[PDB]
Design a binder for this molecule. Structure first.
Ligand SMILES: CC(=O)N[C@@H](Cc1ccc(O)cc1)C(=O)NN
Ligand SMILES: [Cl-]
Ligand SMILES: [Cl-]
Ligand SMILES: [Cl-]
Ligand SMILES: [Cl-]
Ligand SMILES: [Cl-]
Ligand SMILES: [Cl-]
Ligand SMILES: [Mg+2]
Length: 343
């Protein structure tokens, strides 16, 4: 056990191992930036807020720690350390998570930088390389958007902030909804991993034009923007939508054909236009997958099938398990004490 030291910053007690120095608040939890003297990295230290206050909260704490412990890929956020000052399960209450400190996100890049087609190729290639890994473990991210993509000066990218959202958070003219697949924004059906591929299409379109693809002022305005681009659904997709009311609303709209994407994304690389047509498909069964997209000719200068790895198997059976708060807490404590740091 390391030696801990205790200090109060911005009305919060932080008790952390001596290796973590120069704690500085930077904003589910509270977060400080710090310097890790053991590894030389600048890090983010997150102190969880009330992690075991309810069954839902205790299970969410366990879910987040299990997910972060599993992810070991160059294009995905991983866990550098996890610790508690508790010396026994009986006095266990606080959980701290340590990750690499991220600087710029993709928002900074799109708004403030002049991108070539080569930049778009490399950025989207890395998102898909990370998604092939995530999807191989039957994990769905659910919340891909520019603020959840970290990028550095050499254009290297990492996926973060997995979906572990309230009705109020998705209401109105908000970026929290503009990148979501229609079937999940509208609760049409049980959804699959290609909800994440719809998000990649929206992100790639924005990198090519500098503009949000579907900036709806509410859920239904956004659906109208989507159907104007990709066309209204046929009977084949309509049959897959659960709500009779939802089906009735969609059939109340005048029918529209799919638009010509070369006349929407004017001047873009024709191979980029082709890939967008394969991502932005309304019926999720027919969207391209991450593994299929990496083999598309748009990425010919980066694709290396011997350097696009898959994940170890991931056991999610806990998600269907009903336990008490103290049982979720004990499972979490076991995962804290068994953590083994990376090289
Ligand atoms: C036409 C359509 O798909 N309507 C949706 C609207 C909605 C979105 C989010 C909800 O939580 C609830 C409703 C619909 O009726 N889906 N069942
Ligand atoms: Cl230490
Ligand atoms: Cl990482
Ligand atoms: Cl504690
Ligand atoms: Cl965003
Ligand atoms: Cl019509
Ligand atoms: Cl597992
Ligand atoms: Mg985020």
């Amino acid at each position: 056990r390391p030696t801990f030291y205790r200090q109060e910053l911005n009305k919060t007690i932080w008790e952390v191992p001596e290796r973590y120095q120069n704690l500085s608040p930077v904003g589910y939890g509270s977060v400080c930036a710090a310097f890790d003297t053991k590894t030389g990295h600048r890090v983010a230290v997150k102190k969880l807020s009330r992690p075991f206050q309810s069954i839902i909260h205790a299970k969410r704490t366990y879910r987040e720690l299990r997910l972060l412990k599993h992810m070991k890929h160059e294009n995905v956020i991983g866990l550098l350390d996890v610790f508690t000052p508790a010396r026994s399960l009986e006095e266990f209450n606080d959980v701290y998570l340590v990750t690499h400190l991220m600087g710029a996100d993709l928002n900074n890049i799109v708004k403030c930088q002049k991108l070539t087609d080569d930049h778009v190729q490399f950025l989207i290639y890395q998102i898909l390389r990370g998604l092939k890994y995530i999807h191989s473990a039957d994990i769905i991210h659910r919340d891909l958007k520019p603020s959840n993509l970290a990028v550095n000066e050499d254009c290297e990218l990492k996926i973060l902030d997995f979906g572990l959202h309230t009705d109020d958070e998705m209401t109105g003219y908000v970026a929290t909804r503009w990148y979501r697949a229609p079937e999940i924004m509208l609760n049409w059906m049980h959804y699959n991993q290609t909800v994440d591929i719809w998000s990649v299409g929206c992100i790639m379109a924005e990198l090519l034009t500098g503009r949000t693809l579907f900036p709806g002022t509410d859920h239904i305005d956004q659906l109208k923007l989507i159907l104007r681009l990709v066309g209204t659904p046929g009977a084949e997709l309509l049959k897959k939508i659960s709500s009779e009311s939802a089906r009735n609303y969609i059939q109340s709209l005048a029918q529209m054909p799919k638009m010509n994407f070369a006349n929407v994304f004017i001047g873009a690389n024709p191979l980029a236009v082709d890939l967008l047509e394969k991502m932005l498909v309304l019926d999720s069964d027919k969207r391209i997958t991450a593994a299929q997209a990496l083999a598309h000719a748009y990425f010919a200068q980066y694709h290396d099938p011997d350097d696009e790895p898959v994940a170890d198997p991931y056991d999610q059976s806990f998600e269907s398990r009903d336990l008490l708060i103290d049982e979720w807490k004990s499972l979490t404590y076991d995962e804290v004490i068994s953590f083994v740091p990376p090289p």
